[PDB]
Amino acid sequence: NSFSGYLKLTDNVYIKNADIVEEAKKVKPTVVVNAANVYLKHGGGVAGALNKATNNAMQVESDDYIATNGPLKVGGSCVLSGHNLAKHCLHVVGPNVNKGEDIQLLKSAYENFNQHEVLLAPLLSAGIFGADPIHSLRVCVDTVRTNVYLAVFDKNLYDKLVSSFL
């Protein structure tokens, strides 16, 4: 495929220091993963960046989804359009540690990835969701069996994830 410049961590997990928006625009993957919240309000972090790249179409679609179906559950997901970034967007809700949500639900969140053969994704529950990114990467590797291409924006965090990997 057209994923380029990734470091192989395991048989099926790959990582790159890259902006996931820029990577999606270049590769046009079948699935890009959004780091969503249960209301699909794409205000900040990865979600805010992906939605802005779609010129707010992701938010309009999401609002219709919530009006029809109600909120997601922490650990859950839904598949919506990828707009100009991808065929599909898999919106996955990891726990937000700043809200007291149970970190054990991060494993449930990553299990959603197993329904898709290839994904471009961020580290779930990192950044503004408050979890330790080294832990998130460990759960990813121990849970996901399909092909995942992880994009980590912060170069200092990228170097720490690679250098500390077991």
Burial state string for 131-145 with b = 16 or more CB within 10 A and e = fewer than 16: bebeebbbbbbebbe
Question: Where exactly are the structural domains of the chain?
Answer: 7-164
Q: How many CA atoms lie within 13 A of 69 on its CB side?
A: 16
Rounded to an integer, what distance in angstroms lies between the CA atom of residue 2 and that of residue 139?
26
Q: What are phi and psi of 8, to 5 degrees?
A: -80, 120
DSSP secondary structure code for residue 73 in this structure: P
Q: What is the DSSP string of 80-141?
A: EE-TTT-SEEEEE----GGGT--TTHHHHHHHGGGGSSEEEEPPTT-GGG---HHHHHHHHH
Strand order in the sheet with 77-81: 7-8, 13-17, 147-152, 118-121, 31-35, 88-92, 77-81
Distance of CA 145 to the CA centre of its chain: 16
- Helix (H) / strand (E) element for 79: namely strand 77-81
Q: Are strands 77-81 and 147-152 parallel, antiparallel or unpaired?
A: unpaired
Strand partners, 149: 14, 120
CATH architecture for the domain at 7-164: 3-Layer(aba) Sandwich (3.40)
Q: What is the resolution of this structure in A?
A: 1.6
Rounded to an integer, what distance in angstroms lies between the CA atom of residue 109 and that of residue 102?
12
Assign 23 to helix, strand or coil.
helix
3-state secondary structure 127-139: HHHCCCHHHHHHH
Are the beta carbons of 42 and 130 closer than 8 angstroms? Answer: no
Rounded to an integer, what distance in angstroms lies between the CA atom of residue 135 and that of residue 160?
12
Are the beta carbons of 129 and 136 closer than 8 angstroms? Answer: no
Rounded to an integer, what distance in angstroms lies between the CA atom of residue 102 and that of residue 96?
8
Q: How was this structure determined?
A: X-ray
Burial state string for 7-44 with b = 16 or more CB within 10 A and e = fewer than 16: eebeeebbbbbbebbebbeebebbbbbbbbbbebebee
Rounded to an integer, what distance in angstroms lies between the CA atom of residue 123 and that of residue 135?
10
In the chain, what is the straight-line distance between the N-terminal and C-terminal CA atoms, in Å?
Answer: 27
Q: Which residues have a C–N gap over 2.5 Å right after them in the chain?
A: none
